[PDB]
Design a protein around this ligand. Structure first.
Ligand SMILES: [Mg+2]
Ligand SMILES: [Mg+2]
Ligand SMILES: [Mg+2]
Ligand SMILES: [Mg+2]
Ligand SMILES: [Mg+2]
Ligand SMILES: [Mg+2]
Ligand SMILES: [Mg+2]
Ligand SMILES: [Mg+2]
Ligand SMILES: [Mg+2]
Ligand SMILES: [Mg+2]
Ligand SMILES: [Mg+2]
Ligand SMILES: [Mg+2]
Ligand SMILES: [Mg+2]
Ligand SMILES: [Mg+2]
Ligand SMILES: [Mg+2]
Ligand SMILES: [Mg+2]
Ligand SMILES: [Mg+2]
Ligand SMILES: [Mg+2]
Ligand SMILES: [Mg+2]
Ligand SMILES: [Mg+2]
Ligand SMILES: [Mg+2]
Ligand SMILES: [Mg+2]
Ligand SMILES: [Mg+2]
Ligand SMILES: [Mg+2]
Lengths: 50, 70, 107, 50, 80, 155
RNA sequence: UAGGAGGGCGCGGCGGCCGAUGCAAAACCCGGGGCGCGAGCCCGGGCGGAGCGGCCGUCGGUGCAGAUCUUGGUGGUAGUAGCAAAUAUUCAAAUGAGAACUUUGAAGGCCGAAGAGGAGAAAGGUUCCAUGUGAACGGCACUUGCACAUGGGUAAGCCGA
RNA sequence: GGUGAACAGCCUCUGGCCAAUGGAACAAUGUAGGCAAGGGAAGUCGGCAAAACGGAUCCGUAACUUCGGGAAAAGGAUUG
RNA sequence: CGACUCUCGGCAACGGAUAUCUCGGCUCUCGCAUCGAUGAAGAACGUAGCGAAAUGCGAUACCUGGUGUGAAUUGCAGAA
């Protein structure tokens, strides 16, 4: 719930569904799928990933 | 050239056992440069990697033995 | 000098008494040793068909006479030890059998 | 095991981050004595025992 | 037998990680830590082992609070 | 860095060293003791002809148990010798390295010969082995330091 | 012999006295020359590169060949005993400085399905996967790995808790 | 899958392997496994070890007995 | 003559004694009295541009603020 809320306030998008897992090294990793209104390419280049 | 990454990824794709994948000896260069399941599938469709046929276990003597028991 | 000759390897007398789990490997050792004596080259390469022929009848029975052809040829490899080697392969046998077949020399 | 408590996963994370040979550069810090990492652990030799 | 035949059946845990002391000494069935006595209110400590008294006395930890008490004593517990 | 025995003449000599060599000290002692005072070229030929199992290196001091052979009747009449391959190969690597150093100085390689060959134990490397009744024992190698000096022959 | 007493040699300090010391102190080595019946002492040679003695008084954790003595190291033993159950390996090729041990292909055999097959509970903890690798390890060997280094990987409203 | 009463053993297919350090030789003594003329326990403390019997169909099955057993008793015959 | 065994002498190894040290220990003496429900000792997890440990610190995380001093930190790189 907090992950979707923050992904909305930052980056001004929404998540249609988030998956989470705690990676073995220790931190948590979250897969935030965007509702297909927004484009992940566009966000990845708005923050610089790819 | 070690192809232990390609006997696996091929028994998985060809859905056989590692003893049924056949990798042509002549083109180990291209087989080795093939580095993914996607590339294994293009090699399978291009004919370099083959499913060997199943070893024959014919029941013909069994059938003849029964057809001589009736 | 490059040369191809057809020999008959009496293998019973060279494998007699050998342990079963070793009669075929000793058959291959005797083929190499026989090519070495016959053509003086230390390097003998056995063709996969000669191997298959010898190994086809198990490990504990091997053909008794194997009509082989040994081809001493030039070692064309720029890096090499010897100036020539011998490549032994299985050889076609006439229908009349090995009756009176000596050592011939192939054209 | 495959069903591990979050406490044990939490502590495996740290016993993972505690396995690296000492950095290459520490070795030149002034008046230095740390030579190799004498607190290595191997999965087959020294069991954590927890 | 005893020995080789019998060390193969070590498969369960008598002790898991205690929460008050962090050691692997929490007897599960008995529900008590064999090192810090837990869940008892007071800590298990005995004078037949001064070594085990020093290994877990005061001073071997962060002293997150009392390390500042001497400094606060100097200047007589002052707030500005 | 400086060896046990300095050459007769230092300007006409080449030297090669190997420290902490992982090869059996006893085998390489007997190799050196077989090779001392041979010519460089006959030493290369002899030592390769040993590596190729054609001619033997007699065992004299550390020889209790070494079985007999005929290939060594020339230099040890009782016929007791072996063919240390790993040691002969290490000594060949040092012989080639000293022949190279002698070429770099500028001596007649064909006139070189083994002036001074020494084998000398090094720090034993350790590994543990397992014995009946759960008793573990040392399993330790005896590596050697091998030094040699090739000096040009003089009339 | 047990045992006793006297006079001495030696070690480490303390209070004094006499000095040596980068023209080489301490320590240690010698087929070096001596002195003493003896503990020991003096000098030479060498390595060594910074501190050291001798005398009187005084003190003490002071003298080693033993204790199935403690710790550490090193021998002979000894290149010796030995690496032997689970049927089995062989031939071309390729890579590599190097091939019995890596990889491919052809062959020949074994597990023979209450399996030497496919999955889990426990327990382990990153062993999983890729790229590479000087050592060490893999009780032979290695181009190799469950070894070493750098990265990657574990997604649940429905399986669980 | 086959034989077989059978998840016995023995061979095969799917799947997995050839991982157990290799080369040469056939001496004693060993360890595991065989075979032996005439005799068959004389060996030995003791038939210890090994051999002989072993499936199935048909017949027959004693003393004794708690009348349930003995019993697959014993002794025979057949097998493709 | 030569090999082996014992040995003597020179050098080189093996090994870490001896000598010179010492941000350590031990002993004696002295000064003060200051933990915790306003959450302590201890434990755990995190925390650095490149850190694992030790040393700090707590999502403000090898620190923030004040004050004093008065030009650095430092294995490297970087804003200064
Ligand atoms: Mg989840
Ligand atoms: Mg284990
Ligand atoms: Mg049980
Ligand atoms: Mg219990
Ligand atoms: Mg022997
Ligand atoms: Mg044990
Ligand atoms: Mg004393
Ligand atoms: Mg004292
Ligand atoms: Mg003593
Ligand atoms: Mg032996
Ligand atoms: Mg054995
Ligand atoms: Mg079952
Ligand atoms: Mg399994
Ligand atoms: Mg090894
Ligand atoms: Mg793996
Ligand atoms: Mg049937
Ligand atoms: Mg069956
Ligand atoms: Mg008989
Ligand atoms: Mg009898
Ligand atoms: Mg008798
Ligand atoms: Mg009798
Ligand atoms: Mg009797
Ligand atoms: Mg019996
Ligand atoms: Mg009866």
């Amino acid at each position: 719930k907090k992950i979707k809320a923050a992904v909305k306030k930052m980056y001004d998008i929404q998540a249609k569904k988030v998956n989470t897992l705690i990676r073995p090294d220790g931190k948590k990793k979250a897969y935030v799928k965007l509702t297909p209104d927004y484009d992940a390419l566009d966000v990845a280049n708005k923050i610089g990933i790819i | 050239v070690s192809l232990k990454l390609q006997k696996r990824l091929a028994s998985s794709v060809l859905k056989c056992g590692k003893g049924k994948v056949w990798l042509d000896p002549n083109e180990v260069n291209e087989i080795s440069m093939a580095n993914s399941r996607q590339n294994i599938r293009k090699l399978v469709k291009d004919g370099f990697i083959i499913r060997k046929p199943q070893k024959i276990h014919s029941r013909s003597r069994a059938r003849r033995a029964h057809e001589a028991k009736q | 000098e490059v040369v191809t000759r057809e020999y008959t390897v009496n293998l019973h007398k060279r494998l007699h008494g050998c342990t079963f789990k070793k009669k075929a490997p000793n058959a291959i050792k005797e083929i190499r040793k026989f090519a070495q004596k016959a053509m003086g080259t230390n390097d003998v390469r056995i063709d996969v068909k000669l191997n298959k022929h010898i190994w086809s009848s198990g490990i504990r029975s091997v053909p008794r006479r194997v009509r082989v052809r040994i081809a001493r040829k030039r070692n064309d490899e720029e890096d090499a030890k010897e100036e020539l080697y011998s490549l032994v392969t299985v050889a076609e046998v006439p229908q009349e059998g090995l009756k009176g077949l000596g050592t011939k020399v192939v054209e | 095991p495959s069903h591990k408590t979050f406490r044990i996963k939490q502590k495996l994370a740290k016993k993972q981050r505690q396995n690296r040979p000492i950095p290459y550069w520490i070795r030149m810090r002034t008046d230095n004595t740390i030579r190799y990492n004498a607190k290595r652990r191997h999965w087959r030799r020294t069991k954590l025992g927890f | 037998t005893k020995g080789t035949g019998s060390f193969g059946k070590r498969r369960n845990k008598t002790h898991t990680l205690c929460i008050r002391c962090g050691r692997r000494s929490f007897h599960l069935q008995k529900s008590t830590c064999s090192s810090c006595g837990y869940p008892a209110a007071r800590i298990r400590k005995y004078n037949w082992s001064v070594k085990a008294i020093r290994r877990k006395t005061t001073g071997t930890g962060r002293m997150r609070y009392m390390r500042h008490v001497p400094r606060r004593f100097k200047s007589n517990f002052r707030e500005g | 860095v400086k060896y046990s025995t300095d050459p007769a003449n230092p300007t006409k000599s080449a030297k090669a060293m190997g420290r902490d060599l992982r090869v059996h000290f006893k085998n390489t002692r007997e190799t050196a003791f077989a090779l001392r005072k041979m010519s460089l070229n006959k030493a290369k030929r002899y030592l390769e002809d040993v590596l190729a199992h054609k001619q033997a290196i007699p065992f004299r001091r550390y020889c209790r148990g070494v079985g007999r052979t005929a290939q060594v009747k020339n230099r040890q009449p009782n016929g007791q010798g072996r063919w240390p391959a790993k040691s002969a190969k290490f000594v060949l690597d040092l012989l080639k390295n000293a022949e190279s150093n002698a070429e770099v100085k500028g001596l007649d390689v064909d006139a070189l010969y083994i002036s001074h060959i020494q084998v000398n134990q090094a720090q034993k490397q350790r590994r543990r082995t397992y014995r009946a009744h759960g008793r573990i024992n040392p399993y330790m190698s005896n590596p050697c330091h091998i030094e040699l000096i090739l000096s040009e022959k003089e009339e």
